[model samples]
Target: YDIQAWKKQCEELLNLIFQCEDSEPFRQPVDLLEYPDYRDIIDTPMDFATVRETLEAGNYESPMELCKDVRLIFSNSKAYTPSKRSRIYSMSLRLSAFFEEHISSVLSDYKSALRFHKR
Candidate 1:
């Protein structure tokens, strides 16, 4: 696999995600002081900036690695929030929805690329 190609694809999606106004809270690290039990509740806390740093280092072995972190960020947000009616939950829900809309094509390309592996 051309690892650089995967990085570029992931970066492009990240850029799109960053441009979203609703993604403001996720753009940076969360203050653990505010949520003291954050580490206890979430196995691996993730943020957009953290993802970018990992991507910048080319640490992702495959598209799925990058995908997992993105999902973790959303899932962590949802799980940490109190209720679906919460503002944080609402924001994450909308941003996650927006991300899925754009990420499908990128994932489909990964699926198609895997066919070559089985051959």
Candidate 2:
């Protein structure tokens, strides 16, 4: 319901999709034309690349801003077809989860270190 929960689901879904991609056979040219829906799915890597570039360029002021950017990109990739839309939703959920988990852990560690330093 909350953003955090949504984020967790997004990350898990993205991870699942990426894992499947690694295990699956390479796509032939015919596959792309035969299944237009595949285009949206294929664009995910580019989306990720853009996000990475944005972060590296210091374009986002905070992690939350970066998270929003990613979520927006994934949400937009959803197709009108139920199946394709489902895939997009799944990817967004996993992406969000990935950000939440890693960011939370980093912040936690930083805070803990700060406390230790002050002691």
Candidate 3:
């Protein structure tokens, strides 16, 4: 697939995710010094705002790259956040599934379109 077009498609998907209630926490921007303790443990923290930063800087070379970072956002939460009944824990779970669902639909549509147009 053409990279530029795929980038546009991925950007749109990211935006859709940003507008959701479950997406709010991760979507909010993080301040470097604001949560140093969490950051210290998170080590390789990734969130929606950070993804937007990378997007603007054009570091996402492939959809896979973005997907992994999106995955990281949730895994990082689970790695350090709450237990089963915790609010943030459930939020992360729900949001991750939501992303997976939408991403699957978009990939199906994108792939189907490419298949039909193939020689």
Q: Which candidate should be chosen as best, given TM-score against the real structure? A: 1
Give per-model CA RMSD.
2.0, 9.3, 3.2
For model 1, how does the per-residue alpha-carbon lDDT over 25-110 read when each residue is reduced to its tens digit? 88987789988998888888899999988988878877778888888999999888878888877899999988888777777777
Residue 74's lDDT in candidate 1: 96
- Candidate 2 lDDT by residue in tens digits, 1-119: 12233334334534453454421221112145556776665544235545555656657554465566555554544432266546545655555565556566534544565567677
Model 2 weakest lDDT span, ten residues long: 22-31
Q: Report backbone clashes per prediction.
A: 0, 16, 0
User: What ranges in model 2 sit over 4 Å off?
Assistant: 1-46, 77-81, 84-91, 106-119
| lDDT tens digits, residue span 24-113, model 3 | 778854456765678767778778988877877899865667778999989887877747767777888999998887677556655665
Candidate 1 global TM-score: 0.87
Per-model CA lDDT versus the true structure: 0.83, 0.48, 0.76
Which is superior by TM-score, 1 or 2?
A: 1
Specify the poorest-scoring 10-residue window by lDDT in model 1.
Answer: 1-10
